Design a protein around this ligand. Structure first.
Ligand SMILES: CC(=O)Nc1nc2ccccc2c(=O)[nH]1
Ligand SMILES: [Mg+2]
Ligand SMILES: [Mg+2]
Ligand SMILES: [Zn+2]
Ligand SMILES: [Zn+2]
Lengths: 327, 324
């Protein structure tokens, strides 16, 4: 059920070398992958090697893994290959800034979970699948797509010469598959609200303890949300262009809903585009700002994500009619 | 309504020789014509001679054509004669680095099309013309300015001692005028998006075939867009002074709203320049980077344009973040 890369695809990736000027750039939270498309698989290799080491994974198996993950992402406006690399780069920057708080297993596990977190996404939300009683909704009653993304990751790992974790002990393998399962499942935003409220309580009451596994799982969960939403932490024109992609995907689902005799929520209605700036203000106040605020409290070196998010919350200027030119 | 040039103008250009110091510099994609105002028509003659040969056009007719083309460029802030020569130099560098891919008819057609691409521009976008109901919109319905620029080119070619293509066979003249029309039309940015999307698909699926005329036409169109936007491919001190160019059409319209006693919305207002570096970042990511990426895929020797565009994108980021 998992697509497989060609020998030409993985062989080419093995040869790739990151340009010198990008090495400085890639370490920054605000780094936008957008203008380096041909370099995306190559950028992931580089992040895995700098964070985990060159001998952490067998080069051929990792290059086959990367290229098959690329092939298993669909041609959808937002939950695509670019989004996967974007989310992985944000994880990398959080990891580099908080390196010793995480074990080698968690680091390789989280970078792999970020690259695969939306594998085989169809441009449809859990709301859609659960309403239109799709087989995925019967198979996965809760966090529908997120369980499907995790299943897809396992399926790519099970391909010939794709098991990048083969060199781990049967215990460590089971440990990494669990790190990945919980991290992919934590990308379901329905789970974020409860997770964030719990972390805020643990942090404020001073009970938060990074050596307590249940606490680590929550902090990892918030890191997954933070990386998944990282378009809101880029420079404004980058943020705005990605918001057009997100809405292009939401509106195509609203279109599919109409044909099926059900009217969509305003956010998924292409005839309600005027409601977008207020909806973004609502999303930033209810989700993005609280996420990065709690994450900065737990991991202070992540402070730039919060600053960049407050800067984009630009949406206020848009609502007041002071926006700039589009191309 | 086409304008001719004086005897003194075309004659002075015939005497022109490019200074040696510029012979290798001009071959570079990032070459800036900026400091050489007096040499602009001469630089174009030099480029035609090097690309098409000295026997391509009768010197006198060519020099007459060029001086009339210059005449026919209004004193607008962006879509002026400087722009025309900048665009033509970028076509020269693309053509020279892909020396075996283009026919003699395509090379002469494209350099002339680039020099003539923005003929008699008034500083307004096609959006404004069919909004404020300008007379040009009544003349030309779609790709309003581009249809006008080609009308203006045919208008100049039909003037006495200006048909630089009179030395061609019945079919060859029809072939060249078609290349030019298609090339000037392709400069309508509104057409670029769909063209580039189609080319991406073709290249990726392996269906791109340069033996196929409609495929050549599409590739030529993307080259016209690449040349049209080339200020983004210059060195930083040259590009940093080019920030207001992409805003020229928004501000032209705002100026017209200001003439109706209407303070326009900030994006159309020239006194609101604080968003200019952010507008550059947005234009590079949405327009220029994809253009140069697709162009480099089809024509690998064009890679320096993509590199220089990426370099300036990084400089604009630094400006926004307040690091330079
Ligand atoms: C209204 C709303 O939910 N907007 C929205 N905006 C987003 C912007 C960036 C990344 C993710 C999102 C997202 O999930 N939702
Ligand atoms: Mg997801
Ligand atoms: Mg034009
Ligand atoms: Zn995601
Ligand atoms: Zn132009």
């Amino acid at each position: 059920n998992a697509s497989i890369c060609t020998s030409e695809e993985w062989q080419g990736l093995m040869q790739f070398t990151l340009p010198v000027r990008l090495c400085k750039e890639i370490e920054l939270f605000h780094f936008d992958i957008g203008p380096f498309e041909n370099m995306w698989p190559g950028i992931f290799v580089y992040m895995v090697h700098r964070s985990c080491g060159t001998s952490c994974f067998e080069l051929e198996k990792l290059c086959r893994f990367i290229m098959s993950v690329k092939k298993n992402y669909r041609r959808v406006p937002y939950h695509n290959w670019k989004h996967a690399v974007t989310v992985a780069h944000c994880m990398y920057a959080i990891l580099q800034n908080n390196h010793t708080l995480f074990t080698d297993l968690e680091r390789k596990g989280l970078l792999i979970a970020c690259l695969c977190h939306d594998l085989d996404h169809r441009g449809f939300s859990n709301s859609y699948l659960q309403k239109f009683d799709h087989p995925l909704a019967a198979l996965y009653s809760t966090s529908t797509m997120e369980q499907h993304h995790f299943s897809q990751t396992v399926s790519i790992l099970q391909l010939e010469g794709h098991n990048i974790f083969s060199t781990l002990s049967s215990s460590e393998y089971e440990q990494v598959l669990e790190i990945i399962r919980k991290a992919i499942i934590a990308t379901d935003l329905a789970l974020y609200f409860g997770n964030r409220k719990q972390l805020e309580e643990m942090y404020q009451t001073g009970s938060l303890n990074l050596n307590n596994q249940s606490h680590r799982d929550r902090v990892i969960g918030l890191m997954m949300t933070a990386c998944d939403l990282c378009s809101v932490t880029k420079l404004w024109p980058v943020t705005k262009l990605t918001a057009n992609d997100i809405y292009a995907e939401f509106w195509a689902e609203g279109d599919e809903m109409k044909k099926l005799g059900i009217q969509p929520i305003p956010m998924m209605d292409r005839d309600k585009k005027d409601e977008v700036p207020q909806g973004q203000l609502g999303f930033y106040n209810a989700v993005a700002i609280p996420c990065y605020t709690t994450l900065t409290q737990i991991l202070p070196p992540t402070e730039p994500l919060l600053k960049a998010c407050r800067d984009n919350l630009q949406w206020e200027k848009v609502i007041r009619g002071e926006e700039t030119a589009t191309w």
